Design a protein around this motif. Structure first.
Motif, PDB file in Angstrom:
ATOM      1  N   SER A  10     -13.137   3.524  -5.532  1.00  0.00           N
ATOM      2  CA  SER A  10     -13.476   4.667  -6.376  1.00  0.00           C
ATOM      3  C   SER A  10     -14.974   4.783  -6.608  1.00  0.00           C
ATOM      4  O   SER A  10     -15.487   5.902  -6.703  1.00  0.00           O
ATOM      5  CB  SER A  10     -12.759   4.577  -7.724  1.00  0.00           C
ATOM      6  OG  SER A  10     -11.354   4.670  -7.575  1.00  0.00           O
ATOM      7  N   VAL A  11     -15.681   3.658  -6.713  1.00  0.00           N
ATOM      8  CA  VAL A  11     -17.137   3.707  -6.753  1.00  0.00           C
ATOM      9  C   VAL A  11     -17.683   4.016  -5.369  1.00  0.00           C
ATOM     10  O   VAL A  11     -18.636   4.787  -5.222  1.00  0.00           O
ATOM     11  CB  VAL A  11     -17.700   2.389  -7.314  1.00  0.00           C
ATOM     12  CG1 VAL A  11     -19.220   2.405  -7.342  1.00  0.00           C
ATOM     13  CG2 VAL A  11     -17.151   2.143  -8.705  1.00  0.00           C
ATOM     14  N   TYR A  12     -17.069   3.438  -4.330  1.00  0.00           N
ATOM     15  CA  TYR A  12     -17.432   3.769  -2.953  1.00  0.00           C
ATOM     16  C   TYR A  12     -17.181   5.234  -2.618  1.00  0.00           C
ATOM     17  O   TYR A  12     -17.903   5.804  -1.793  1.00  0.00           O
ATOM     18  CB  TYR A  12     -16.677   2.871  -1.977  1.00  0.00           C
ATOM     19  CG  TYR A  12     -17.308   1.516  -1.796  1.00  0.00           C
ATOM     20  CD1 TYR A  12     -18.616   1.280  -2.209  1.00  0.00           C
ATOM     21  CD2 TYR A  12     -16.615   0.477  -1.195  1.00  0.00           C
ATOM     22  CE1 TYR A  12     -19.212   0.040  -2.039  1.00  0.00           C
ATOM     23  CE2 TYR A  12     -17.208  -0.771  -1.022  1.00  0.00           C
ATOM     24  CZ  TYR A  12     -18.505  -0.972  -1.447  1.00  0.00           C
ATOM     25  OH  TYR A  12     -19.104  -2.205  -1.283  1.00  0.00           O
ATOM     26  N   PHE A  20     -17.613   7.459  -4.926  1.00  0.00           N
ATOM     27  CA  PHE A  20     -18.780   8.023  -5.592  1.00  0.00           C
ATOM     28  C   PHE A  20     -20.062   7.688  -4.840  1.00  0.00           C
ATOM     29  O   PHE A  20     -20.933   8.552  -4.690  1.00  0.00           O
ATOM     30  CB  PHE A  20     -18.858   7.525  -7.036  1.00  0.00           C
ATOM     31  CG  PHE A  20     -20.073   8.009  -7.774  1.00  0.00           C
ATOM     32  CD1 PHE A  20     -20.160   9.323  -8.203  1.00  0.00           C
ATOM     33  CD2 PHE A  20     -21.136   7.150  -8.031  1.00  0.00           C
ATOM     34  CE1 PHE A  20     -21.284   9.779  -8.878  1.00  0.00           C
ATOM     35  CE2 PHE A  20     -22.262   7.596  -8.703  1.00  0.00           C
ATOM     36  CZ  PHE A  20     -22.336   8.913  -9.127  1.00  0.00           C
ATOM     37  N   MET A  21     -20.194   6.444  -4.353  1.00  0.00           N
ATOM     38  CA  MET A  21     -21.446   5.996  -3.735  1.00  0.00           C
ATOM     39  C   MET A  21     -21.728   6.708  -2.419  1.00  0.00           C
ATOM     40  O   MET A  21     -22.883   6.778  -1.985  1.00  0.00           O
ATOM     41  CB  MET A  21     -21.431   4.484  -3.504  1.00  0.00           C
ATOM     42  CG  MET A  21     -21.608   3.641  -4.752  1.00  0.00           C
ATOM     43  SD  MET A  21     -23.219   3.873  -5.520  1.00  0.00           S
ATOM     44  CE  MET A  21     -22.994   2.947  -7.033  1.00  0.00           C
ATOM     45  N   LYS A  22     -20.693   7.223  -1.758  1.00  0.00           N
ATOM     46  CA  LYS A  22     -20.933   8.015  -0.557  1.00  0.00           C
ATOM     47  C   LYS A  22     -21.177   9.478  -0.898  1.00  0.00           C
ATOM     48  O   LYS A  22     -21.932  10.164  -0.199  1.00  0.00           O
ATOM     49  CB  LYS A  22     -19.766   7.871   0.419  1.00  0.00           C
ATOM     50  CG  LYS A  22     -19.588   6.460   0.949  1.00  0.00           C
ATOM     51  CD  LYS A  22     -20.837   5.989   1.676  1.00  0.00           C
ATOM     52  CE  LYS A  22     -21.034   6.727   2.986  1.00  0.00           C
ATOM     53  NZ  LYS A  22     -22.216   6.213   3.726  1.00  0.00           N
ATOM     54  N   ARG A  23     -20.556   9.979  -1.969  1.00  0.00           N
ATOM     55  CA  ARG A  23     -20.654  11.399  -2.283  1.00  0.00           C
ATOM     56  C   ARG A  23     -21.802  11.714  -3.241  1.00  0.00           C
ATOM     57  O   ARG A  23     -22.277  12.857  -3.263  1.00  0.00           O
ATOM     58  CB  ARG A  23     -19.314  11.903  -2.842  1.00  0.00           C
ATOM     59  CG  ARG A  23     -19.150  13.422  -2.775  1.00  0.00           C
ATOM     60  CD  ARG A  23     -17.753  13.907  -3.127  1.00  0.00           C
ATOM     61  NE  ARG A  23     -17.417  13.704  -4.530  1.00  0.00           N
ATOM     62  CZ  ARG A  23     -16.420  12.946  -4.964  1.00  0.00           C
ATOM     63  NH1 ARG A  23     -15.635  12.323  -4.099  1.00  0.00           N
ATOM     64  NH2 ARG A  23     -16.201  12.827  -6.265  1.00  0.00           N
ATOM     65  N   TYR A  24     -22.288  10.728  -4.004  1.00  0.00           N
ATOM     66  CA  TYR A  24     -23.537  10.920  -4.738  1.00  0.00           C
ATOM     67  C   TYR A  24     -24.722  11.016  -3.786  1.00  0.00           C
ATOM     68  O   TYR A  24     -25.724  11.666  -4.104  1.00  0.00           O
ATOM     69  CB  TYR A  24     -23.750   9.782  -5.738  1.00  0.00           C
ATOM     70  CG  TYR A  24     -24.993   9.916  -6.591  1.00  0.00           C
ATOM     71  CD1 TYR A  24     -25.052  10.847  -7.623  1.00  0.00           C
ATOM     72  CD2 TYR A  24     -26.100   9.102  -6.375  1.00  0.00           C
ATOM     73  CE1 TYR A  24     -26.184  10.973  -8.411  1.00  0.00           C
ATOM     74  CE2 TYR A  24     -27.238   9.219  -7.159  1.00  0.00           C
ATOM     75  CZ  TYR A  24     -27.272  10.157  -8.175  1.00  0.00           C
ATOM     76  OH  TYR A  24     -28.394  10.282  -8.959  1.00  0.00           O
ATOM     77  N   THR A  25     -24.624  10.372  -2.624  1.00  0.00           N
ATOM     78  CA  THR A  25     -25.601  10.589  -1.568  1.00  0.00           C
ATOM     79  C   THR A  25     -25.422  11.968  -0.937  1.00  0.00           C
ATOM     80  O   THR A  25     -26.401  12.588  -0.504  1.00  0.00           O
ATOM     81  CB  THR A  25     -25.466   9.477  -0.524  1.00  0.00           C
ATOM     82  OG1 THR A  25     -25.512   8.206  -1.184  1.00  0.00           O
ATOM     83  CG2 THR A  25     -26.600   9.519   0.492  1.00  0.00           C
TER      84      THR A  25
END
Length: 37
Positions: A26-28, A30-35
């Motif tokens: 779930s953070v991953y 986020f961590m791909k889509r915040y980029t």
């Protein structure tokens, strides 16, 4: 005396394992889509 845990104890045990592994993803997610923004 005999005591022994059951299937739903093992069901609640494995339910921990899929919940925390998704929060890593779930953070991953986020961590791909915040980029991506």
């Amino acid at each position: 005396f005999n005591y022994k845990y059951g299937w739903s104890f093992a069901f609640a045990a494995i339910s921990f394992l899929l919940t925390e592994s998704a929060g890593v993803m779930s953070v991953y997610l986020f961590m791909k889509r915040y980029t991506a923004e």
